[PDB]
Every structure is written in structure tokens, then in C-alpha cells.
């Protein structure tokens, strides 16, 4: 099962305040209208690729989704009211779940919880957003940017990850790409819109002109090049 990610998967690219401006940046973002795998927890916690970074989102009614495993190890678990983070050689089950050499340790549908997980030069960077929803069938359509919270100096070569569910709640997994986005910051420094510069030719024009409105006419935006298919 797959769904339409629409315009989800944008986050504040850095820690600088900007307002009333259209800012162009390149980072690992979820491509607009990409295909995100749709998982269910009714009457589904497989090992997934991490690739170059993961977009994760979930919709909750009972707080079933509580954590993640990352590695080829990083373990993040939210058990009731307290978040626990470890990079210990934890003994995992053949099928890990929760019930209803440590180099780092830390201890602290109605609900949409969006996350971004990326690993750059050993740093595991986490962004997130929590917003209320009123929808059971699928991911709600709309736009909001996610904020950075945690950045762990783990040094772990993460290639795969697995989610953790509490057993006696759907979730979505996408992948980030080095896309260029034009981000629209309103008067309060909130990103309210965005253009995925590689989505389609109109988006390319919007990014080229640094505007969300394109006047009537013909615009040169790029250069077509035939790529090599093999080396000789």
C-alpha cells in the first residue's frame, strides 16, 4: 500500500530566523507528491532501508508507535512518559516490539506526528512536528514545516531501520532527496509554502524566477543534456 505525500516533508533547513522572504535552499527533503509506503496496525513493523535519510510520519489514536532502531546500533524508545535514547549493543528480538558497549545514553486519527531522520558525517539529525488532525483514512493534505530538536554524535553507519509498535495506528515512510526548494517565509518567520524545484516544469520556472507567481510568457529555466550510459 502507498499514498500521496502531497506537500509534506519540509523542515527549517537551518537555525536562522528569516521573514517576509523567498529563500532558496538545497537539502534532503521529501520530494513533493512522492510515493510513501503505507503501513497499518489493525486486527506491521518490517525492516526498511534508511538510504540517504528517512521521512517518517504517523497518525495516532492510541500512541502505538513508540520508537525506532537504526543500524546495519541506535535505539530510540518513548515508553509512556519518558524518552530513552541508547547506542548500546542491545539484544534485539527476531521481531522487536513493545508491550502495552554504550557510547551514548540519554533519558528524559487525532494526532499527526511528523519526523525527519538524516545522518550526516556521523550526526543523526532529528526534526519533528506535532499537529492535531481529524482523519482516519489517510495522510491529511496541507503544509507545515518541521523543526530540529536533537542531533546525536553517534558515528553509526546506518543503512537500515525498523519501527517499534506497542502490542496488546497507521504510519508512512518516505525517503529524502537533495532537492532544491524555494521556501516562503511569512511575516512571523513561518514557512507557509514551498516549491519543489524538480517536481515539474512550472515549479522549475517558479524557482528560476524566485517567485510563487509566474507571469505570462516564455522562460528559459534549464539545460537539457543527454547523459552517458556507459564508460569506454
Amino acid at each position: 500500500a502507498y499514498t500521496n505525500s502531497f506537500t509534506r516533508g519540509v523542515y527549517y533547513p537551518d537555525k536562522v530566523f528569516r521573514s517576509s522572504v523567498l529563500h532558496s535552499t538545497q537539502d534532503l527533503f521529501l520530494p513533493f507528491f512522492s510515493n510513501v509506503t503505507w503501513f497499518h496496525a489493525i486486527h506491521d513493523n518490517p525492516v526498511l532501508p534508511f538510504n540517504d535519510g528517512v521521512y517518517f510520519a504517523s497518525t495516532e489514536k492510541s500512541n502505538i508507535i513508540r520508537g525506532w532502531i537504526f543500524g546495519t546500533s541506535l535505539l530510540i524508545v518513548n515508553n509512556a512518559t519518558n524518552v530513552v535514547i541508547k547506542v548500546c549493543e542491545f539484544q534485539f528480538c527476531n521481531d522487536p516490539f513493545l508491550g502495552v558497549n554504550c557510547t551514548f545514553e540519554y533519558v528524559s486519527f487525532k494526532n499527526l506526528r511528523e519526523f525527519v531522520f538524516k545522518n550526516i558525517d556521523g550526526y543523526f539529525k532529528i526534526y519533528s512536528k506535532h499537529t492535531p488532525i481529524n482523519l482516519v483514512r489517510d495522510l491529511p493534505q496541507g503544509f507545515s514545516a518541521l523543526e530540529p530538536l536533537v542531533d546525536l554524535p553517534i558515528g553509526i553507519n546506518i543503512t537500515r531501520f525498523q519501527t517499534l509498535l506497542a502490542l496488546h495506528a497507521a504510519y508512512y515512510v518516505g525517503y529524502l532527496q537533495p532537492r532544491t526548494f524555494l521556501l516562503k517565509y511569512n511575516e512571523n518567520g513561518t514557512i507557509t509554502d514551498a516549491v519543489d524545484c524538480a517536481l515539474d516544469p512550472l515549479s522549475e520556472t517558479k524557482c528560476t524566477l524566485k517567485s510563487f507567481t509566474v507571469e505570462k510568457g516564455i522562460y528559459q529555466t534549464s539545460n537539457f543534456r543527454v547523459q552517458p550510459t556507459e564508460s569506454i
Binding site: 520556472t205 507567481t213 516564455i218 528559459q220 534549464s222 539545460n223 537539457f224 543527454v226
Partner: peptide, 30 residues
């Protein structure tokens, strides 16, 4: 290898989001 400019032909976005794309100085092959 064949290359060329790419231009986007568009009515204003106030009217339509449909676009046409011109691949400049190329054949309708590659």
C-alpha cells in the same frame, strides 16, 4: 552529447498551471 536550452511556455499562473516545454535546438528523439 546533444544538449540545449529548456524553456517553459506558460499562461500566467493567475489563469492556468498548465505548461508546455520547449527543448531548444534539438530533435524530437533524445
Amino acid at each position: 552529447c546533444s544538449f540545449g536550452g529548456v524553456s517553459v511556455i506558460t499562461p500566467g499562473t493567475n489563469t492556468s498551471n498548465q505548461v508546455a516545454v520547449l527543448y531548444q535546438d534539438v530533435n524530437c528523439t533524445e
